[PDB]
Write a protein that binds this ligand. Sequence first.
Ligand SMILES: Nc1ncnc2c1ncn2[C@@H]1O[C@H](COP(=O)(O)OP(=O)(O)O)[C@@H](O)[C@H]1O
Ligand SMILES: Nc1ncnc2c1ncn2[C@@H]1O[C@H](COP(=O)(O)OP(=O)(O)O)[C@@H](O)[C@H]1O
Ligand SMILES: Nc1ncnc2c1ncn2[C@@H]1O[C@H](COP(=O)(O)OP(=O)(O)O)[C@@H](O)[C@H]1O
Ligand SMILES: Nc1ncnc2c1ncn2[C@@H]1O[C@H](COP(=O)(O)OP(=O)(O)O)[C@@H](O)[C@H]1O
Ligand SMILES: Nc1ncnc2c1ncn2[C@@H]1O[C@H](COP(=O)(O)OP(=O)(O)O)[C@@H](O)[C@H]1O
Lengths: 270, 155, 499, 483, 490
Amino acid sequence: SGRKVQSGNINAAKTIADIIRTCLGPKSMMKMLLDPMGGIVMTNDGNAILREIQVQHPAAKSMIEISRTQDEEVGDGTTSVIILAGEMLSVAEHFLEQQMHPTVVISAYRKALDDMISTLKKISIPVDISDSDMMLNIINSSITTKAISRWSSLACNIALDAVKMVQFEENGRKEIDIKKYARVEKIPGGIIEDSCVLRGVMINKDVTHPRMRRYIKNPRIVLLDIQQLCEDIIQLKPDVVITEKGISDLAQHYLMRANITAIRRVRKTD
Amino acid sequence: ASMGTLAFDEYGRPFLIIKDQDRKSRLMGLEALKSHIMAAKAVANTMRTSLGPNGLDKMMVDKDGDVTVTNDGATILSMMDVDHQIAKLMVELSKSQDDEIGDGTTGVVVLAGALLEEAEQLLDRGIHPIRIADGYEQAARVAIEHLDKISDSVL
Amino acid sequence: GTDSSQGIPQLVSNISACQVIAEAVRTTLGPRGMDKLIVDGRGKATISNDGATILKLLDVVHPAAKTLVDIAKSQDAEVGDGTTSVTLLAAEFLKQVKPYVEEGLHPQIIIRAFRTATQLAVNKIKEIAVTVKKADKVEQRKLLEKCAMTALSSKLISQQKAFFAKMVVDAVMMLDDLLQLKMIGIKKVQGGALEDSQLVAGVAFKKTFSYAGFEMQPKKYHNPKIALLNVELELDYQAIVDAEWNILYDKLEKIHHSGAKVVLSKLPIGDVATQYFADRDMFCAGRVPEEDLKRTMMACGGSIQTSVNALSADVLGRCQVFEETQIGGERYNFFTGCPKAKTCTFILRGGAEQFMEETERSLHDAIMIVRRAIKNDSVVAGGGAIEMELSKYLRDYSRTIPGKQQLLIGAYAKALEIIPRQLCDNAGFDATNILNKLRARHAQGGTWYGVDINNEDIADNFEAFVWEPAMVRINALTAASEAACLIVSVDETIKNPRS
Amino acid sequence: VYRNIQACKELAQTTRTAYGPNGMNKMVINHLEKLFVTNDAATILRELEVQHPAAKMIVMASHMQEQEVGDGTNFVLVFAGALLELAEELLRIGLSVSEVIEGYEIACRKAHEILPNLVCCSAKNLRDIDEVSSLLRTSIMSKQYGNEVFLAKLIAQACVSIFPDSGHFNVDNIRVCKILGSGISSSSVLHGMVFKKETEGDVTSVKDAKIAVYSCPFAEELMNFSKGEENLMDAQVKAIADTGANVVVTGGKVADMALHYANKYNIMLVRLNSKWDLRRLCKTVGATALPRLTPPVLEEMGHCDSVYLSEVGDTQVVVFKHEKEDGAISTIVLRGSTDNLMDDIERAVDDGVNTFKVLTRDKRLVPGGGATEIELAKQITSYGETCPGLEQYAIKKFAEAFEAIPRALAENSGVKANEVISKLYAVHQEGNKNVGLDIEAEVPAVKDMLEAGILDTYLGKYWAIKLATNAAVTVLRVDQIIM
Amino acid sequence: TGETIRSQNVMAAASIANIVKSSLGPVGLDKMLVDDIGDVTITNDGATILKLLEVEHPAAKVLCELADLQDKEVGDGTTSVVIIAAELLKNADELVKQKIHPTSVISGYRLACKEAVRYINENLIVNTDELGRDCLINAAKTSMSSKIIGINGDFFANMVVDAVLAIKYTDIRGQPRYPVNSVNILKAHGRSQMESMLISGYALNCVVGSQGMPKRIVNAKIACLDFSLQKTKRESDITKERIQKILATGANVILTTGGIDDMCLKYFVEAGAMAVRRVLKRDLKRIAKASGATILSTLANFEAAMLGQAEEVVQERICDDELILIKNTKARTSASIILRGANDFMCDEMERSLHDALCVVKRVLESKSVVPGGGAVEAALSIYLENYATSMGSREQLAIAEFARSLLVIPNTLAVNAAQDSTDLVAKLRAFHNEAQVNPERKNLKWIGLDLSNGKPRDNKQAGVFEPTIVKVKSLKFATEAAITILRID
Ligand SMILES: Nc1ncnc2c1ncn2[C@@H]1O[C@H](COP(=O)(O)OP(=O)(O)O)[C@@H](O)[C@H]1O
Ligand SMILES: Nc1ncnc2c1ncn2[C@@H]1O[C@H](COP(=O)(O)OP(=O)(O)O)[C@@H](O)[C@H]1O
Ligand SMILES: Nc1ncnc2c1ncn2[C@@H]1O[C@H](COP(=O)(O)OP(=O)(O)O)[C@@H](O)[C@H]1O
Ligand SMILES: Nc1ncnc2c1ncn2[C@@H]1O[C@H](COP(=O)(O)OP(=O)(O)O)[C@@H](O)[C@H]1O
Ligand SMILES: Nc1ncnc2c1ncn2[C@@H]1O[C@H](COP(=O)(O)OP(=O)(O)O)[C@@H](O)[C@H]1O
């Protein structure tokens, strides 16, 4: 108890902080993992090694979870956070030992972070938006030094369209964005240059029997989950209705009587 | 009871105060007095059977192995293996009585043992030894005047 | 196999050793205090109710214990017998500051607070001290006689105790030169009534087989003085045997020519030659005790001879008269009749053989109690009354001090309470109720209520004539506080063995 | 190298708590197993028989520091320990021993050339006994606690001001005579050298007296042997009384025949002489020892001018005064309960004497009580970032080592060191040099002590800083040795 | 092996206290709690700590359920009761160890508890009246302290206390009541936080249902509805008959939670109604109870009088936002607070501070009998009980004395958790309260406690650090009962 518990927490923190302190940068060293059966894997990624390693101390588990949840939040920097936290705790070593309460340390750290935010906002050189030259400079800065060195153009164009097909002007001016509504289609086959961008979602599923009309100049898609609903849809007569129930041939002709084209066996992901 | 107090610390860190109290012994007040009066039982009830005309003799052997049978109580208790200090004090009580009287060695030891035993079950009732000492001094003066009542002289 | 010598661990070890030292001699405080027979390991058991003697015979190896014992000895040699009190008080300070040093109270704060509380107590005691010296003490000595009563209260010897107190008090007026322990002694006499004890302006020493030469001395002699000789006097054939006879003849001639009434020789004088050595025509003795000598050079100046035929003016010098009478059927040897006989001996006349210890505990206290009453003027009610008053003052002043000194002074006040606690412990009464009543009465009712050893109840010990010198208490408390400060001021122990 | 650093760090930590007036006492058990209580760092370290050679180097550097400054050894230990423990983590960073050595040398030179910029010096001179006594309170507060400084300063300064001849001052003449008795307040000052004798046949008014120091101090056949012994003793005493000898000193006992022979020539029998006296008498009155009682010759014979017994302190002691310099020797008479607290008192007296001697070599003084330490630390750490290169880290670490001392003094006072050091460093920017730590307040408050007069010396501090830096540099250079 | 079982029970209680000791106070440290499966648990308050703590020893368990039953009564001070009980247990065990029989200990503890609880009633405060203005403001600011929002903080405190006192209920019992969910936060754009003023009633930022609303209508009957007025293809298309009937019943301002009608503008200007969308259900119930109405499952089958009314409705644009000022209804429950800034996210600190100020003001408004905070009460009882014991007389002197000493463990814990030196602060508190009774002139000094924001002695009656009397009384009684129950075990 006493200082010993905090010392244990922060030592367990420093250990997993400096276990991979070498693993960042364009010249990262490659770490060595072996399971207790002889299986061998050679890893160069901090997230992978932190995932595969097994540790028991609660502080280490908490910081590993912090890194893991920060991974999806921002992507890059997933190891710099761990290195920074470990180094800050290792320097707090010397103040914990000289008998000062953690409260003043927390206050000083919060003041330091408040200064951090302003200082970062100050020195940051401005950059414009969608201009090709420095955008490609950014691509070289971050996307390159990896296995897409000889295929950077496809990533560039995909990113350039992607940053423009997920715009959300919900509560401001396009400041809202998402990374999960992009209808990405990773289908193997052909040269890698076959990739392209198409405006609007597309679905891997369609009608089993294409003896029927699907394309209309004004597609009024309606979401839906017994023919009572089928002829109650006539309230407005949408041309296309998307549902999750199977359609028979007689049911398909009932849909035609209802001026709708339903779909079956489609997951919520679509 | 055993090992005194079993904490080994006040918070939980390694710590020690008494050197090997596990095989030592600590006595404070009543327990010590019980030890002394139990020694008094040992000496007195060993001594008692050599009293009166039907008083039998004793065989006592030291660590050397001396063969000794006697009938004078001071002689029985003279060379017996005395271990406890108050028992030894009773031994020189008998020695002094023999030196300045020469008779009645059996009486003093048995009387002291009886007084001390009755004092211990007095203490078992929760009474402090000063009162018992005062009452015993009063009993002593009463006995002395009673002896003086019926004294007699010879040639 | 536990090692603990770090600063705080060493401090707690030292003060725990002091606690053990106090626990050893807890129960010997007071007049009705009990004792323990301690054997030196040589077969000599020792009984002495005085705590100072117990520590003197005790041997402990801990450096903290050694320092505490040294401070106790220093207190012993200065005034009275407060060694038990000061040791208990210091140990109480330490055991009540245990829960303060155990969590981070720096020693210097404790030292400063202890000094402040000691000054507060030594200043607040002077507002309560009452002087009685002018209240008919030098003359009309009823109050001083009652002070003598208080040393021997509640005993059937009261009929003899009144006469013994008048005895010692008159001895005080005719020896009012700041009497000490060694200036007055006692001698044992077997047989006789207790009332028969009477004071002689001299010493008593029964003659033994190797003490005196022959009987029927000239008791009514105008100028008998002690003469000490460092030459043997008691009793190839024609070379050393005739030399021995010549030596005997010339020594006998020297004794006859000297004319000294009392003659002491360094070799023992055998009584088998009483008829052989009755021809000296004056008293001759030998194997003089050192105590008897030390009680005679200051009496009328006995001389020492250091030659074959040494003669001095003080072999037959000016001393008043010699006493030699049958005491209990056996003739003693009194070196009385001296112009400066500054040594009054109480003849222990009693029918109890084992009454020596009771006489020592009952006659040595009266002279000391009256001497301390005379020497100092301001006195305060004893029996823990002054301790309770000081505790109340320090407790009520601690809450008035803003700062870390508050808890330290509070613990100091709480530790000044053991004296009534220890007194009622040695009395055998349950401490809780008597201490409770004493504290409640002292805080609310009166400022001088103290413990009563006779009826075992709370009473105003000021009315019971329970006195004590204010200066003695002041210096005892100061010494205890200094001891506590020194023992708290320890950080590290360094031994660095030569081997 | 880390083992040497650990050893020096532990040694410094052992005696760190004794720094300043609020030093913890120490339980000192000597080789002969004797109780001893004290707080002086030199006493315990001189008793500490450490084993690590790096500890040997640092302790002998401290000894050299005490050689010509007389105090500050605790400071040099704390400072060197701080320097080494910071050098430990600097080496752990990955630096080289050499470059930190040059950095420390540069920092030491910078400190030496910036030190004389704190001028709070002596007022006018060593005279004005009261004023300089108020000045000399520094080491008195240092070793002895502040309770008794009021009298200790006066006793220590009145004695050293007896002989201010030609501006030359010496320490060996200053001695302290051990006189047990009443309380400390009864201690006083005297001129000369004090020791006691046995016999009472003493003459006070004595002219130039020749001191006779002894290297070796004190039926017919029976009568013949007694007469022969009498003749031999008479021959010995007449040999002693030759050449008109008037005073004789001896460490032996007395005898009735011996005193009769001494008074036959009307000569006092100085006996029970102290064991330390045999050669101090020779060095103080030009005396010499005698192999036995027959060969006192005038050529090998002492010479004292005044030999009279003094009853000061209610004790019979003979004091020698009006010597060849007529004021050189000047003793101090003490009074206390026991020798245990007497030792600290006399050590504080020695520290005061040494500081006064340093003042004789330098009338220039600097503020104390954490003032000058933090001032030098501020100056050096401000200069540090202005110096490009790798020596900058060593410079900041030297500054931190300066910072260490006020922290040690604070934690010895019992207050929170971090709070008081932060407050003091912050105030020192505008609350300039004269500010410093306050002892009395339990709250960590600062206090300007230019008015207080607690100002430590300049030359002593300069030499202490230089020698501690040199010691740290030397111990940093050694790499390893098998042990 | 095993001896003096009471000592082991006391040690277990002390361990339980030491687990929770450092977590007491707003600045108390957090704890990591680990179960068998390794779940994470971070908290400050000890109630949930003991809820999730895995206790094993029986005597410690007893303290666990005593703390639990303390929680069910007042929901606060469980840490304090546990710490007080542990301190009392260790003191009483010590007293036994110097051979005072525990029956006197129990009697003295009961007597001291009665004396202290009687002393509380004679030294409490009832200043939480209509005249308490500055104390309320500074208490709210202490709750809001350590925030930059304090530049305009005084105005926020004034408006929030005015809103909470105006919204005060009047129940059947008569004691003041306040609905927490009635008031809510509302973001704003444009001018900064320095201009965030009071809103007299609940306002919803939605489409302008009827801009031609009079500034103060004679009667505004609020008719909240869930059915939308949308045209389809007792009426086939629910657009006209429902609204016409609800208007004919008497309702004036008819509210539909769903979407608006295409032609509803003409209907809503001639009937004094408006269709306001995105009505929060937690706020729909609040406005229904403010007007006095209830949510309608369906309008089909009440509406003439069941639907509540208001005496004015304002339709104006405030700080670049048009709000539906359905304010001053039949019952004063409709209220809202405007938060001026850019968005909800960066204003989390100010809305949290407003919420905590609301909570503390609602706590101090009810339970008019109140006591000073910051350890003032503990110091006052420690001053009372020591003297009372000394004046009591019987064998229970030391029991009450150690009770008084144990009542000063809470200030020590507060001082430690505030990083200040514990002994100095508790000594300052006790010395300050010394003259609060010794000198009758310093009668107002009784309300001296710790200033947790800095760690200094300061009056808290003015500072407003307040606790209900019932909470502390029941806390002390529960602690004493637990102490008696444990000490009666051997
Ligand atoms: N070629 C490079 N030259 C200089 N710095 C680089 C280079 N590549 C990456 N970095 C730096 O390394 C840091 C970490 O980025 P990186 O290692 O790519 O991902 P992560 O932060 O997830 O480890 C970045 O802040 C960046 O500034
Ligand atoms: N014939 C007897 N009848 C009754 N009592 C006897 C007789 N002989 C001895 N006694 C008792 O035995 C006691 C002790 O005698 P004993 O043990 O033989 O020697 P001692 O008197 O030395 O102890 C005496 O007190 C005496 O009263
Ligand atoms: N008759 C008495 N009644 C009560 N207390 C007494 C009596 N006589 C002496 N005392 C107490 O004894 C104490 C002195 O004991 P002390 O001489 O210190 O014992 P020791 O000689 O063992 O140290 C005093 O404080 C006094 O209160
Ligand atoms: N009254 C005082 N207040 C603050 N500091 C003091 C005081 N008296 C002495 N000091 C400091 O104590 C230091 C010396 O103490 P110490 O290390 O114990 O002995 P030494 O003089 O041998 O170094 C000095 O540097 C001085 O600044
Ligand atoms: N700002 C403050 N300053 C001083 N004391 C406070 C403050 N806020 C709360 N307290 C104290 O905290 C105590 C309640 O804390 P705690 O027992 O941890 O709450 P809970 O019982 O809900 O866990 C109250 O008695 C109160 O005196």
